[PDB]
Design a protein around this nucleic acid. Structure first.
Lengths: 125, 78, 96, 60, 23, 114, 155
RNA sequence: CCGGGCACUCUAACGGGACUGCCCGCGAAAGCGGGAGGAAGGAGGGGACGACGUCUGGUCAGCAUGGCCCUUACGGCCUGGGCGACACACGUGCUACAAUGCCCACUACAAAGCGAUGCCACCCGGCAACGGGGAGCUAAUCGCAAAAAGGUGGGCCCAGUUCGGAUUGGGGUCUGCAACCCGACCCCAUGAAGCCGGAAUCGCUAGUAAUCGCGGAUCAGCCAUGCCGCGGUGAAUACG
C-alpha cells in the first residue's frame, strides 16, 4: 500500500509514506504547497522523486516534527530517498551516486565556556 | 490604597501638633512619607552623618522624608 | 505503575528487571522496563577560588526516571515484592 | 566582620527579605547553590572527592 | 526596534506584555 | 496656524500629522479619530474644513498641548527645584533625575563632554 | 591552509534554474542568513529583467557575470623598500567571487527604491557595457597593464 | 478522542560499526594520492583530558595556614548612609542611524530546561502592569509556553522620519517592613544623539561567522544588555 522512509537532518523528524499514484503531497494534514509556502528550499525532498523519474508514480503522506522549516525539508530528503530504495532496492543506483541517501551530521555546536557563541571569541586588548 | 509613614514619628507628630505645636523632632526615618499633618514644623532628618532639619510647607506634601536632606556633598569638580 | 527513580542507572537497571523478573514468576504479567527522559540539573562553576571567569567546568545531576506496570495484580505479588532486593541507591514507587 | 556574621544568617531577624544564603563548611556569602547548600568552591572540591551523591563531571 | 518599548519588538526582547504586545 | 495649538502637517495622513503636535503621540491621536470620525487614512489636504474644524473642535477642547504643557511640565520643575527635593536639586545641577550613574555616559543631560 | 590547498566547496544548483552560479549570487545577496528573503530578490528582479527589456532572466545574469569578471588584477607586494602593485591574471575562481561581489555592491548603492529593482537594473546594464561593477572591472584591469613594469615581479 | 495496536516517532540503557581493513597508484619500510562498498571514512563533528615547568603569575577576601599586630576595640549589635558620588579617561557590551527597514493584523515550524506557602490552565475586571476568582501537576501524561525570524497582505515612501528610544513630566501596578537616596514592570506625553564613524583595533574556516528567539542558575523583587546553555534561518573565502 505504502512505501516508507525515515528522515532526519539536524534535530528534525520526517516520516514519509510513498503511497503510489498521481503525485499530490500532504505533510501534517495539508498540501506540501500550503505548509511550505514562501520557501524556495521547499522544492525539495520531492527532488529524490526527480532522481528516479517518479513524480508520477507516487502521491505522498508525511508526518514531521522538529527543527524548523527548511531543516524539516532535508529530513524528507532522507525520507524520500529511502522510501524509493525500499520500493526498488535497485534504485539506490542513481540515488547514492546522486547523493540523496546518507544523513548529514551537520549539527549546531555546543556553546563553549569563554567563547560568546561556541567560537565568537571575546574582544581583547 | 497604600501610603507608608513609619508610625513612630506620626505618633509623636499627632502627639506634638496635638499637645501644643512645637517642632525639632529628631528621627532616623527618611523612608516615611511626609503626611499632611507634618505641615509647618521642623523635622531633623538623618542623611547618614548629619541631622539636616526641614521646615515643612504645603509646597511639598505627598513627598518623602529623605529627598529633603541629601546624603552626598558635591560643591564641584575642579 | 511501579515508578522507579534513582541516580545510578546500572544499579537502577538491575532492580527494574528484578521487580520485572520476579512479579512475572509471582502473578502476571509485568510491563517491561520503560525509561523516562532523564531530568538533568547542571552546575557550571568558576574553577578557581577568585577571579578567572575565563576558566570554569561542567558538572551534571542525572536523575533517570523508570516506570513499570503490573497487569494482573494478585496476592503473593505484593508479598514477593513486599520484601525486595535493594540497592543502597534506588527509589521506589507503588500504585495501580 | 565574619564569624559573628555567619551566626547572623542562622538567626532570622526582623524581616523575611533580610534572610540570605550564607554557607556551611564555607562561611561564604556569594555563589551559594541552595540545592547543594554549597558555595561554588565548597561545591567543586567535594564534587571531585565524590562526597556529592551522583554528581558527575559532564562532557558532551 | 528592540529598545522601543512602545511596540511589538520592544516588549519581546524585554520579556513583557501590555498593549503593544498583550496576552 | 492650521489646527490645534497652531501647527501644520499636510502631505502626510491625518493621524501621523496629529502626532507632530505637542501633547498628542500615536495613542491620543487614534483616540481623536475615534471621537470625531475622520479615518486615519486621509492625507490632510484631503480632509475638507468640516472634518478639520471638527478635528480642532474636539482636540483644541480636550487636552493641553501647545504653548502650555511646556509651561505645565516646567511648573513640575519650577516647584520641584524650588521645593526640597533632591530631584529638583539635580535640576539645579543639570543632572540625571531618575537615578543613573554619572561617573560614565550620562551625556544627554550634560551634552557632549568637556 | 599553510598545509593544505583549502577545499573548494561546490554549491547546490538552484531549484528554479538548476544553476550553481545562481546560488552563488543569491548567497552574496544574502544578509544575516535570511536566504528566503535573498531568493525572492532574484526572481523579484529576474521578473524585472523580463518585464523591462523582454528577454531571458537566465541569460542576462550569466552575461552580467562575464561582463564584470576581471582577467588582470594588481595586488601590492614589498620589494627593496617599495610598495609595487603587481600585475597578475586573476584566476577563474577568484573571478566568480569577484564578479558576483561587485555586482551586489554596485547594485545596493543604486538610487532605486526596492532592492531587487536595483539588482535587475545592474545585471541588465552589465551585459550592456555600462554598470557600476563594470567601471570597477576596468578600473582594476587598466590599473594593471599601467603596471606591466612589474610583470616579472609576479610569482 | 475511545477501543485497538509497538510498526513508527520519541524515550533511555546495552550493543553493532571504520580497521588505510579492500583495490588502484608510489614508496625500503611507515606512509600519501585516488577508487568501491559504506550512515559516516582516513582524529566524522565537538567535549572532557592539558607534560617537566615558566611567569617571586593570582586568591590570607571562599577556606584553611607560619608570623606580625588589635583584645570596653582593628571585637560585636544596631539605626542611617556609602558600595549607585561626576568636571573626565579607557575596556566589554546593548540598541541604533533604516526600505534586504519599521509598523499592524493573521498564519506556521524548535530545542533545553525549570516548575508546592511553585508552574499558575480558564474565565471575569482593567488600554495595561496587574488584580480577582479558579482547574490541573510530586510531573515525557497538568504548567511555564509566546518561540522569534520566517509566510500571507495591508500600512509607511526616503522624511532625522510609522527610522532611532534617549530624556523628562504625570498617572499606575507588583515585590518588600521599607523603593528619598537607589527597584523592575505599565499607560499617556515628552520623542535627544545618531544619516554608519579619525588614528587605531577584535572575532571567526561550515553549520563556523552573521542574524533570530528560548531556558537556567543566583534571585522575595530587581537595576541580565552579564554569564552558562538550547535550538531556528544559514554564508564569505583560503594563490600562498
Amino acid at each position: 500500500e505504502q512505501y516508507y522512509g525515515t528522515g532526519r537532518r539536524k534535530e528534525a523528524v520526517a516520516r514519509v509514506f510513498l503511497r503510489p499514484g498521481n503525485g499530490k503531497v500532504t505533510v501534517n494534514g495539508q498540501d506540501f504547497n500550503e505548509y511550505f509556502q514562501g520557501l524556495v528550499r521547499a522544492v525539495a525532498a520531492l527532488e529524490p522523486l526527480r532522481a528516479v523519474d517518479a513524480l508520477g508514480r507516487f502521491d505522498a503522506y508525511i508526518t514531521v516534527r522538529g527543527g524548523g522549516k527548511s531543516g524539516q525539508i532535508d529530513a524528507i530528503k532522507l525520507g524520500i530517498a529511502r522510501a524509493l530504495v525500499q520500493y526498488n532496492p535497485d534504485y539506490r543506483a542513481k540515488l547514492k551516486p546522486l547523493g540523496f541517501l546518507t544523513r548529514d551530521a551537520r549539527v549546531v555546536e555546543r556553546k563553549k565556556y569563554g567563547k560568546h557563541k561556541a567560537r565568537r571569541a571575546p574582544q581583547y586588548s | 490604597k497604600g501610603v507608608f509613614v513609619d508610625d513612630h514619628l506620626l505618633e509623636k507628630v499627632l502627639e506634638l501638633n496635638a499637645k501644643g505645636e512645637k517642632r525639632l523632632i529628631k528621627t532616623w526615618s527618611r523612608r516615611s512619607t511626609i503626611v499632611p499633618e507634618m505641615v509647618g514644623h521642623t523635622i531633623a532628618v538623618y542623611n547618614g552623618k548629619q541631622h539636616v532639619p526641614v521646615y515643612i510647607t504645603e509646597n511639598m506634601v505627598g513627598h518623602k522624608l529623605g529627598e529633603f536632606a541629601p546624603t552626598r556633598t558635591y560643591r564641584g569638580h575642579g | 505503575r511501579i515508578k522507579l527513580r534513582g541516580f545510578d542507572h546500572k544499579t537502577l537497571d538491575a532492580s527494574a528487571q528484578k521487580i520485572v523478573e520476579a512479579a512475572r514468576r509471582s502473578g502476571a504479567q509485568v510491563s517491561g522496563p520503560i525509561p523516562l527522559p532523564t531530568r538533568v540539573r547542571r552546575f557550571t562553576v568558576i574553577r578557581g577560588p577568585f577571579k578567572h571567569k575565563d576558566s570554569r567546568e561542567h558538572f551534571e545531576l542525572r536523575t533517570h526516571n523508570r516506570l513499570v506496570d503490573i497487569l494482573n495484580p494478585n496476592r503473593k505479588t505484593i508479598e514477593q515484592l513486599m520484601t525486595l532486593d535493594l540497592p543502597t541507591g534506588v527509589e521506589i514507587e507503588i500504585k495501580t | 566582620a565574619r564569624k559573628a556574621l555567619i551566626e547572623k544568617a542562622k538567626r532570622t531577624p526582623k524581616f523575611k527579605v533580610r534572610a540570605y544564603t550564607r554557607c556551611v563548611r564555607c562561611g561564604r556569602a556569594r555563589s551559594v547553590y541552595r540545592f547543594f547548600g554549597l558555595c561554588r568552591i565548597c561545591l567543586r572540591e567535594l564534587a571531585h572527592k565524590g562526597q556529592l551523591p551522583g554528581v558527575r563531571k559532564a562532557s558532551w | 526596534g528592540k529598545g522601543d518599548r512602545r511596540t511589538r519588538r520592544g516588549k519581546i526582547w524585554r520579556g513583557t506584555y501590555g498593549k503593544y504586545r498583550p496576552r | 496656524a492650521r489646527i490645534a495649538g497652531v501647527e501644520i502637517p499636510r502631505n502626510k495622513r491625518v493621524d501621523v500629522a496629529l502626532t507632530y503636535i505637542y501633547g498628542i503621540g500615536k495613542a491620543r491621536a487614534k483616540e481623536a479619530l475615534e471621537k470625531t470620525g475622520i479615518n486615519p487614512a486621509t492625507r490632510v489636504k484631503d480632509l475638507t474644513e468640516a472634518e478639520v474644524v471638527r478635528l480642532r473642535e474636539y482636540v483644541e477642547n480636550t487636552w493641553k498641548l501647545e504653548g502650555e504643557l511646556r509651561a505645565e511640565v516646567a511648573a513640575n520643575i519650577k516647584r520641584l527645584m524650588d521645593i526640597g527635593c533632591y530631584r529638583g536639586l539635580r535640576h539645579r545641577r543639570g543632572l540625571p533625575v531618575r537615578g543613573q550613574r554619572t561617573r560614565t555616559n550620562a551625556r544627554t543631560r550634560k551634552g557632549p563632554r568637556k | 591552509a599553510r598545509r593544505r590547498r583549502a577545499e573548494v566547496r561546490q554549491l547546490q544548483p538552484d531549484l528554479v534554474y538548476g544553476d550553481v552560479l545562481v546560488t552563488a549570487f543569491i548567497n552574496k545577496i544574502m544578509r544575516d542568513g535570511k536566504k528566503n528573503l535573498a531568493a525572492r530578490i532574484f526572481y523579484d528582479a529576474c521578473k524585472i529583467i523580463q518585464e523591462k527589456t523582454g528577454q531571458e532572466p537566465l541569460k542576462v545574469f550569466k552575461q552580467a557575470v562575464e561582463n564584470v569578471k576581471p582577467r588582470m588584477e594588481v595586488r601590492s607586494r614589498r620589494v627593496g623598500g617599495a610598495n609595487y602593485q603587481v600585475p597578475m591574471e586573476v584566476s577563474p575562481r577568484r573571478q566568480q567571487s569577484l564578479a558576483l561581489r561587485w555586482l551586489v555592491q554596485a547594485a545596493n548603492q543604486r538610487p532605486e527604491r526596492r532592492a531587487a529593482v536595483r539588482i535587475a537594473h545592474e545585471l541588465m546594464d552589465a551585459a550592456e557595457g555600462k554598470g557600476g561593477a563594470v567601471k570597477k572591472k576596468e578600473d582594476v584591469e587598466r590599473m594593471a597593464e599601467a603596471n606591466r613594469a612589474y610583470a616579472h615581479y609576479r610569482w
